[PDB]
Design a protein around this ligand. Sequence first.
Ligand SMILES: NCc1cnc2ccccc2c1
Length: 165
Amino acid sequence: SFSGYLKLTDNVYIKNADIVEEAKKVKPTVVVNAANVYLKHGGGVAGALNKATNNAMQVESDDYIATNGPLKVGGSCVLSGHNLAKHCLHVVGPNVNKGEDIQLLKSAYENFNQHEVLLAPLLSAGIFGADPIHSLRVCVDTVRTNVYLAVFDKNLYDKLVSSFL
Ligand SMILES: NCc1cnc2ccccc2c1
């Protein structure tokens, strides 16, 4: 079970933690991946989660894309969680470094509402280029299910908690 999380709202919790280490420890029903439309898990959270599965997440993802085609920005798919979780919810937040609509961030967070509890990163944060303070605000105003946010960066975690309205 989840431990050491700071409660932000009725249903949103946050911790300064590596989401791979958090997943390996808790083994949640759902771990969220910060995916791209192609499910190419190269860097950031996706690269780290895939490397922890010994590339099994990428192999499974390539078969999914070969069958179904790419996801939509703001969309998701449920795949195996491998050694990290029962399931991985691959969610595509807009990548502002690729010029994608930041307004799609709320649609991306709506995917979390189909799962009662999730371990997740902040969508569109990190290498996706959005303001993590904005991502946390969209998260608390969109997600109604129980979300345990893992923020890798200590200095960003402190800034997020200290600025939370
Ligand atoms: N310790 C593996 C690792 C590497 N890179 C990361 C990037 C974002 C979030 C968590 C990460 C975890």
